[PDB]
Write a protein that binds this ligand. Structure first.
Ligand SMILES: *[C@@H]1O[C@H](CO)[C@@H](O[C@@H]2O[C@H](CO)[C@@H](O[C@@H]3O[C@H](CO)[C@@H](O)[C@H](O)[C@H]3NC(C)=O)[C@H](O)[C@H]2NC(C)=O)[C@H](O)[C@H]1NC(C)=O
Ligand SMILES: *[C@H]1O[C@H](CO)[C@@H](O[C@@H]2O[C@H](CO)[C@@H](O[C@@H]3O[C@H](CO)[C@@H](O)[C@H](O)[C@H]3NC(C)=O)[C@H](O)[C@H]2NC(C)=O)[C@H](O)[C@H]1NC(C)=O
Ligand SMILES: *[C@@H]1O[C@H](CO)[C@@H](O[C@@H]2O[C@H](CO)[C@@H](O)[C@H](O)[C@H]2NC(C)=O)[C@H](O)[C@H]1NC(C)=O
Ligand SMILES: *[C@@H]1O[C@H](CO)[C@@H](O[C@@H]2O[C@H](CO)[C@@H](O)[C@H](O)[C@H]2NC(C)=O)[C@H](O)[C@H]1NC(C)=O
Ligand SMILES: *[C@@H]1O[C@H](CO)[C@@H](O[C@@H]2O[C@H](CO)[C@@H](O)[C@H](O)[C@H]2NC(C)=O)[C@H](O)[C@H]1NC(C)=O
Ligand SMILES: *[C@@H]1O[C@H](CO)[C@@H](O[C@@H]2O[C@H](CO)[C@@H](O)[C@H](O)[C@H]2NC(C)=O)[C@H](O)[C@H]1NC(C)=O
Lengths: 775, 676
C-alpha cells in the first residue's frame, strides 16, 4: 500500500570505547512491512562477526564490548549504513560513521612558555594529536592551588579560552612564580587526568626594542567551529614596546576589509578575539593586525561556522499517469553543503541539482527517489515515492490482428480492438505512412457498450503491393500504445515512394525500406552504389531498415537508395532524400565585468552562424520578452546577428537575460546573468562643528547604497588637511553606526576629520569636516 | 665637472651587539667632491648622540659599544640612510636598517615529542621567538653521547633538517630511550649554548586504526627562503597504519598540480621534502598529500626563494639640449620586486615605471635622477645624471617689471626685456587670460641691437579692476621662461569672469580666483555654500587659489564659487563651471576561439561608453584601414557602437586587427590577433 520511509535513522557519528560497547538502531516504516538490511561503504550488505559485530532484531546493529586484541579495523572503524526495503521499493539511510576506539593511555603536557614582561600569555595544554578527537581541556590548576575553569574572566586577568588554553592577560613578574598545569577529560572513557608536565611562564625583562613577531607558520590558519558555540580567535604576537591588536573581517570574497565591531556578543580580550553564540553569518576570513612603535605584523583566520544538515522532499508521495511528468523538489537546510545528489531505489542517478524532473513517466519509473545533502562531516537524507498514476488506466490493445500472407484479390479485414480509460482513438499506419479512406482502403472505428474502441481497416481487394508492415496506434491523451503486424502479398518486388527525410544535426535517422511483394529475398541499402554501412554513424539490418546515429551535413546529407530483389532476378529500387539541415550554433556572451552600477550603458551581443536564410532571433527576460516601454533597445546585425543595447540601466533591468534564437529545424539559446548594483549616496553627510570642552562629541556620517556601504572615518592632526590618517586607538574615540563617537572632547582634538562611504561599486564617497573646541 | 655617484653604500642589514659595536662607512665619488650627510627615515639629517651614535669623517657613521642602560630605540633600532651631495646635485643611498641588540640571556627548550610507533619523528628545538632572528640550531646531542650535525643522513635514520629540527626516520622502541637536546648559536654574541630542557620520544603502541592527522594550524604555511640554500618542506602527519606521503607543486596560479620530481637536487626523506640549491624557479605553492588505508589528509606551503636586488640606470650621464627629450632606463635584477620607484635629487617623483621619460627638457631638469627597486627585506638603488647641453642658450628675462600698488587713473607701463638664443617672443598674461590690443591695453614688442626682446605692456589709464596678477611669458621654440608680478588697484572687491574649466578624469584642476581691488581681505572658495575644502581631492589656499588633485565626474563636476571680500562689508562673487569630460572606455573583444579556418564567417564587436555625442570609430589592420574591395563589412551600432563582419574569410584577412576609436579630448583603441 505504501513504499518504505525512515522513521528513525542512526546519527552521523557513533564513537565508543571497547569497554563500553555501542548499539545503533535503525527503524523504518512501510507497507508491506520492510526488512532492514545493514549495508557497507561499497554497497555490499554487511555480515556478522561473532563477538565484534552482530546484526540483531528490529534493525539493531550491535557492537558489543571487546578486548584490545579483538579490535579489528574492518569492523570497529568503518562506514556503515542502514538499508530499509520492501517489495515495493528500497531506501538507504544517511552514512553512519562507526568509530570504536580502544581505551588507550594518554598523558597531557604543559611546557615552558616564554613572555616579554608586559605582553599577554597563552599557556597551551598539549594533548597528543592522535587522541585529540576524544580528549579536551576541562580546568587549569596552579601550584598555589588556584583553579581556573571555563566561563567569565578571573580577577580581570586569567581566562580559560574556549579552545582549552589558559589566557594570562598582561604578564608581570608576579606570575613567573606559579606553575600551571591542565586537567583533561576523555569523552569516551570518562576519566579526567592532570598533565604529566607542569608549565611555567619564563618572564624576560625588556631592554632592546623588539619588533612584534608571530610564530611563522602560526601566521595563517583555517578553523571550523560548531554552530552556536563560543569561538576563540588568537593573534600570537609578542614584542616590545607592548603592541596593540586590531581585528578586521574581510568582505565576502573581496580585498576590502571592515573593522570588527566589539559589543556584548563579540568581545576582545587583549589580542584574542572571543565570539559568543556563533552563527553562519560569522563565517569568513578574519585578519588581526598587531602594531607597535617599531613595527607591525599580521595574522589571518579562515573561520567557518557549521549548521546541522536536514533534508525534505516535496512531495512525500505522488501518483502520476503514464507519459506525464513527475517533479521532485529537494528542500534542505544546513551549512556548509558540499554535495547535493539524487538517488533511486538504492542505486544513484546522475542528477546533482535540487529539483529532479522526470519529463515523461513510464512503468520503470515507479518506486522510491531519495535526495542526499552531504559534506565533509555530515550527511542528511530525504525520501520520496512515485506511484504509477492509475485508477486512470492507459490504452491497451486486446483483440488485435496478427501476421498474414496471401495472394492478391481477396478482401482483407484487419481489426484492432483497443481498450483503456479514457477510451482511445485508433489510427492506422502502413510502413510509417498514415492511410485513411484513400483508394479502396476503408477505415472505421466505433465504441462498444463496455467502453472499448473497435477499429477496423478494410481493404477492398488487396493488391499486388498493398503488402508491408501494417500497424494500429491506440492513442489516448493519457498515453499511447501500438500494435504492428506483417501483411504479405504475392507479387514482384516493389518499393514505395519515400518523401524527403528532413533530419537535424546529431539526431538519429531511423528509416525502413518499404518493400512490397512477398517472395522478397534481399533488401540492401546503398549509397552511390556502395553498400550503406561504411562508417561509425551507419547501421543496416537484413529486415531492410537503416539507422544513422549522429547526423551531420556534408557527411550524410544525400540521396540514399534501397534495393529489394527476390530470388531469381526481379528487383526494385527506392530513392530516399536524406536532408540534413545545420542546427544554429550560438556563440556565448560577456557583459562588462563591473558589475553594472545603476545608471549604466550595457551592450550584449548575440552572434550565431548556422542554418542559412531563416533566422528568428528573440530576446527573453525571465518570464516574458521585452516591452519596449521598459527602455531596452533590441537591434539586429546585417547577416542576422543581434545586439541588445541598454542605455540608462535601472533596477528593473536586473535578472536573468537570455538570447532565444531559432532556425528552420532547430532552436538554440544562451543565458547570461545581469546584476544591477547601486553606488553609495549620502543621506547625512556631516555638519562642520565645534563642541564645548570635554563634551561627548556625537557627529553622524551616514550613506545609503547597494551593497550597504561601510562608513570609515579618519583624522588630520595638525589643523591642516592632507595627512588624513586612522584615528587614535582609545576608548575616548570610537566609531559606531558610522557615527563618530568621541567621548569627552579634548582641546587637542581640534582639526579636520574625514568620513568615507564605500561599498566598492564605484570610487568612494568622501566628506571633510572640522571639529573644534570651545570654553 | 660631474655629479655625485655612490662608490660604496652600506648593507641593507646591520645587526650588532652592545658589547661589539658597529660602524657603517658610506663612500661617494664626484666633482666637486661631495659632502656625506647621513639622513633619517623621515628625511631629516641625523644628528649626533655622545656615546651612542657619532658622525665621523669619510662619511663613517659610528655606533660605538655601550651598556644596557644606555640603549635607546631612537638610535639603536632605526632606519638610517647615507646622503652624498655636491653643489651639482644630491643622491640618497639605499635604506640601511640599523639593529643594535643588547646581549641578553636566552635558553632553548626541547620538549617531549609523541609518536605512534612506526611513523617518522621531528624533534623541534624551541627557541624564544623574540631572539629567533639572532639564534639558530647548530647540532643535536643525545644522552648516549651521539652528536648529529647538519649534512647527510646518519645511519640512514637520523637527519638534521636545514631549519634546525632533528628528523628521526621511522621511530621504533629502540629510540624512546635516548634523550635529545639541541645546541644553539647566537650569531651576534657568538656563544653556543645547549637547551635547558631535554626532549624525548614518547613512543606509543598502535592498536586502533588512527586516521592520519595534522596539527590543525600546521595545515597551512608560507615560507621565504634565501637564494641557493637548502629548503626544508615538512608534512606533519601521524597515523596508523603508517601513512604514505606524496608531494605536488601547483602550476603557476592555476588549480592544476604536477607531481614533484625526485632526483639528486630535490629529495624526499620520509614525509619531509628537502630541496637543495634553491632557485627562484622553485618558488610556488607546494601541496603534500598523506594517505593511508583509513583516510587522507593534506598540507600546503607557499614557498618563495629570494634573489639579491641590484639596479643600474642606462645611461649613467647624458647631456640633452633644451626642449629635447631625455630618457632614463632602469635595469634591475632580483626577486621578489615589490616597488620600482623613481627619485630626483633627493626628493621623490611620481613615476613608478622602469623607463623615466622627460618629454621636453628645461633648466630645472638638470641634476641627478635616482631609481629605486625595493621590497620587504631589501632595497637596491641606481643613480644617473642629466647635464644641460645647448650652445644654444634658452630664454631668460633681464629687466622685468616688479610688484606695484596704486589708485586708478594714471597710465601704467610694464616692461619685460627678455633675452635668449634664438630671440624669443614675449606674450602677456593677466590671471591666466591672454590680453592683447584690447580696450585701452596696448601691447608692444621690438628687438634691441644686441638681440634682446623688449616687450612693453602699456595700460592707458589703469581702472578700478585692471589690477591682479600680471605675467609676461618669454617663449622660445627652444624652451620657455616666464615672470609674474602683482599689480594692485584701489577699488571695491571685484571678481572677474571665469570661462568653464573643462577637465578630464584624474587630472589635477588648478584654478585661481581672479580678484580685483586692493584692500581685499578674504578670498574664500565655496561649493554650494559650504567652504570648498569638502573632499580628499580638494585643497585651497588663502592666496585665493583652489586645486583639486584627482578629478572625477559625479564627485567634483559642478559650478564652484569664489567669494572675495574686503575689510568692513564689501564683497564680490565669482562662479566657475568645472566640467568633467570623459575619456572613452573601450570594452575588449573575443573572436570565436577556433581559430578561424579559410572560408569562414567572423564577427568582431567594438563597444565603447564614454564622451557623449562625438564618437569617431575606425578599424585598422596593421599599416592601413579597410579598402572595401578587399571584402570586409564594417558596420556601426545605434548609439555609436561598432560591428566588424567578415563573411568569406581569406588568407589576406590574416594579421593584427585593431579598433581605433576616438572621442573629443581623447583616443582609445584595442587590438586582437586574427590567425588563419
Ligand atoms: C598660493 O598661490 C599659489 C598659486 O598661485 C600656490 O601654488 C603653489 O605655489 C608654491 C610656491 O610658493 C609651490 O610650492 C613649490 O612646489 C614645488 C613643486 O615642484 C617645490 O619644488 C617647491 O620647493 C615649492 N615651494 C614652496 C616651499 O612653496 C606649489 O608647488 C604650488 N602648488 C601648485 C601645485 O600649483 C601656493 O599654495 C600659494 N603661494 C603663494 C605665492 O601665496
Ligand atoms: C608705452 O611703451 C613705452 C614706454 O612704456 C613707449 O615706447 C617708447 O618709444 C619711444 C618713442 O617715442 C622711445 O623713445 C626714443 O628713445 C630713444 C632711445 O635711444 C631715443 O633715441 C629717441 O630719441 C626716443 N624717441 C623720441 C624722438 O622721442 C622709447 O624707447 C620708448 N620708451 C621707453 C623709455 O622704453 C611707448 O611710447 C608707449 N606705447 C606703446 C605702444 O608701447
Ligand atoms: C579495553 O581495552 C583496555 C586496554 O587494553 C582494557 O582496560 C585495561 O584493563 C586492564 C586489565 O584489567 C587494566 O590493567 C588496565 O589498567 C586497563 N587499561 C586502562 C584503561 O588503563 C579493557 O579491559 C578492555 N575491555 C575489555 C577487556 O573488554
Ligand atoms: C601597522 O601595521 C600594519 C600591518 O603591517 C600596516 O598596514 C599595512 O601598510 C602597508 C603599507 O606599508 C599597506 O600596503 C598594507 O595594505 C597594510 N596592511 C594591511 C592593513 O592589510 C601599517 O602600515 C602599520 N603602521 C605603520 C608603521 O606604518
Ligand atoms: C652590554 O650590556 C650587557 C648587559 O648588561 C653587559 O653584559 C654584562 O657583562 C657582565 C660582565 O662581562 C656579565 O656579568 C653579564 O653577563 C652582563 N650583565 C648582566 C647580568 O646583564 C655588557 O657588558 C654590555 N656591553 C658593554 C661591554 O658595554
Ligand atoms: C588520498 O586521500 C586524499 C584525501 O586528502 C584524497 O584527496 C581528496 O579526494 C577528494 C575526493 O572527493 C577530492 O575531491 C579532493 O579534492 C581531495 N582533497 C585533497 C586536496 O587532498 C585522494 O583522493 C587520495 N589519493 C589518491 C589520488 O588516490
Amino acid at each position: 500500500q505504501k513504499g518504505p520511509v525512515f522513521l528513525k535513522e542512526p546519527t552521523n557519528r557513533i564513537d565508543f570505547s571497547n569497554s563500553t560497547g555501542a548499539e545503533i538502531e535503525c527503524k523504518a516504516s512501510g507497507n508491506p512491512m520492510p526488512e532492514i538490511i545493514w549495508i557497507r561503504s561499497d554497497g555490499t550488505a554487511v555480515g556478522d562477526v561473532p563477538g565484534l559485530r552482530q546484526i540483531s532484531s528490529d534493525g539493531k546493529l550491535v557492537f558489543p564490548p571487546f578486548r584490545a586484541e579483538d579490535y579489528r579495523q574492518e569492523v570497529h572503524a568503518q562506514v556503515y549504513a542502514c538499508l530499509a526495503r520492501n517489495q515495493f521499493g528500497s531506501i538507504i539511510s544517511r552514512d553512519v560513521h562507526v568509530r570504536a576506539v580502544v581505551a588507550q593511555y594518554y598523558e597531557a603536557d604543559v611546557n615552558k612558555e616564554h613572555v616579554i614582561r608586559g605582553n599577554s600569555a597563552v599557556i597551551k595544554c598539549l594533548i597528543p594529536s592522535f587522541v585529540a578527537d576524544f580528549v579536551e581541556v576541562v580546568s587549569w590548576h596552579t601550584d598555589e592551588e588556584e583553579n581556573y575553569f571555563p566561563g567569565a574572566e578571573y580577577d580581570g586577568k586569567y581566562l580559560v579560552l574556549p579552545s582549552g588554553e589558559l589566557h594570562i592577560r598582561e604578564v608581570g613578574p608576579e606570575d613567573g612564580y606559579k606553575s600551571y598545569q591542565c586537567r583533561t577529560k576523555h569523552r569516551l572513557t570518562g576519566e579526567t587526568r592532570l598533565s604529566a608536565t607542569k608549565g611555567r611562564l619564563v618572564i624576560t625583562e625588556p631592554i632592546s626594542s623588539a619588533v612584534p613577531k608571530v610564530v611563522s607558520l602560526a601566521k595563517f590558519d583555517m578553523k571550523t567551529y560548531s554552530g552556536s558555540s563560543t569561538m576563540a580567535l588568537l593573534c600570537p604576537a609578542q614584542g616590545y614596546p607592548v603592541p596593540v591588536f586590531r581585528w578586521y573581517k574581510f568582505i565576502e570574497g573581496t580585498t576590502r576589509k571592515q573593522a570588527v565591531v566589539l559589543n556584548d556578543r563579540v568581545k576582545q580580550v587583549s589580542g584574542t578575539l572571543i565570539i559568543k553564540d556563533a552563527v553562519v553569518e560569522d563565517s569568513g576570513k578574519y585578519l588581526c593586525v598587531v602594531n607597535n612603535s617599531v613595527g607591525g605584523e599580521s595574522v589571518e583566520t579562515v573561520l567557518t561556522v557549521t549548521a546541522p544538515l536536514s533534508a525534505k522532499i516535496d512531495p512525500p508521495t505522488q501518483t502520476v499517469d503514464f507519459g506525464r511528468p513527475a517533479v521532485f523538489t529537494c528542500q534542505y537546510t544546513g551549512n556548509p553543503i558540499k554535495t547535493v545528489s539524487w538517488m533511486k531505489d538504492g542505486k544513484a542517478i546522475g542528477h546533482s541539482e535540487s529539483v529532479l524532473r522526470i519529463e515523461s513517466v513510464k512503468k520503470e519509473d515507479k518506486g522510491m527517489y531519495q535526495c542526499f545533502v552531504r559534506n565533509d562531516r555530515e550527511s542528511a537524507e530525504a525520501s520520496a515515492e512515485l506511484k504509477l498514476g492509475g485508477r486512470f488506466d492507459p490504452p491497451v490493445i486486446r483483440q488485435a490482428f496478427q501476421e498474414e500472407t496471401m495472394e492478391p484479390g481477396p478482401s482483407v479485414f484487419l481489426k484492432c480492438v483497443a481498450g483503456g480509460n479514457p477510451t482511445p482513438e485508433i489510427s492506422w499506419e502502413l510502413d510509417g505512412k498514415k492511410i485513411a479512406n484513400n483508394d479502396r482502403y476503408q477505415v472505421g472505428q466505433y465504441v462498444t457498450v463496455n467502453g472499448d474502441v473497435v477499429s477496423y481497416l478494410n481493404i477492398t481487394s488487396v493488391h499486388a503491393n498493398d503488402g508491408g508492415l501494417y500497424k494500429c496506434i491506440a492513442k489516448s491523451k493519457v498515453g499511447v500504445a501500438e500494435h504492428s503486424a506483417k501483411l504479405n502479398v504475392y507479387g514482384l518486388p516493389y518499393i514505395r515512394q519515400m518523401e524527403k527525410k528532413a533530419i537535424v544535426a546529431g539526431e538519429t535517422l531511423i528509416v525502413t525500406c518499404p518493400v512490397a511483394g512477398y517472395p522478397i529475398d534481399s533488401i540492401v541499402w546503398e549509397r552511390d552504389n556502395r553498400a550503406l554501412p561504411i562508417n561509425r554513424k551507419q547501421k543496416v539490418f537484413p529486415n531492410g531498415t537503416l539507422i544513422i546515429e549522429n547526423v551531420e551535413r556534408n557527411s550524410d546529407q544525400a540521396t540514399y537508395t534501397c534495393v529489394a530483389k527476390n530470388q531469381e532476378g526481379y528487383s526494385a529500387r527506392g530513392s530516399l532524400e536524406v536532408q540534413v539541415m545545420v542546427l544554429p550554433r550560438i556563440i556565448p556572451f560577456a557583459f562588462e565585468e563591473g558589475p553594472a552600477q545603476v545608471g549604466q550603458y550595457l551592450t550584449l551581443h548575440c552572434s550565431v552562424p548556422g542554418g542559412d536564410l531563416p533566422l528568428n532571433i528573440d530576446w527573453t527576460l525571465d518570464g516574458q520578452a521585452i516591452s519596449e516601454d521598459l527602455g531596452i533597445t533590441t537591434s539586429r546585425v546585417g547577416r542576422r546577428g543581434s545586439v541588445l543595447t541598454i542605455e540608462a540601466v535601472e533596477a528593473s533591468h536586473a535578472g536573468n537575460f537570455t538570447c532565444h534564437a531559432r532556425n528552420l529545424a532547430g532552436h538554440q539559446q544562451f543565458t547570461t546573468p545581469l546584476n544591477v548594483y547601486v553606488p553609495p549616496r549620502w543621506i547625512l553627510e556631516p555638519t562642520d562643528k565645534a563642541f564645548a570642552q570635554g563634551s561627548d562629541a556625537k557627529v553622524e556620517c551616514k550613506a545609503d547604497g547597494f551593497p550597504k556601504p561601510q562608513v570609515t572615518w579618519k583624522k588630520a592632526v595638525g589643523d591642516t588637511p592632507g595627512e588624513y590618517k586612522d584615528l587614535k586607538k582609545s576608548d575616548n574615540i570610537r566609531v559606531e553606526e558610522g557615527t563618530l563617537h568621541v567621548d569627552n572632547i579634548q582641546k587637542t582634538n581640534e582639526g579636520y576629520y574625514l568620513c568615507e562611504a564605500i561599498n566598492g561599486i564605484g570610487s568612494g564617497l568622501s566628506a571633510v569636516i572640522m571639529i573644534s573646541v570651545q570654553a
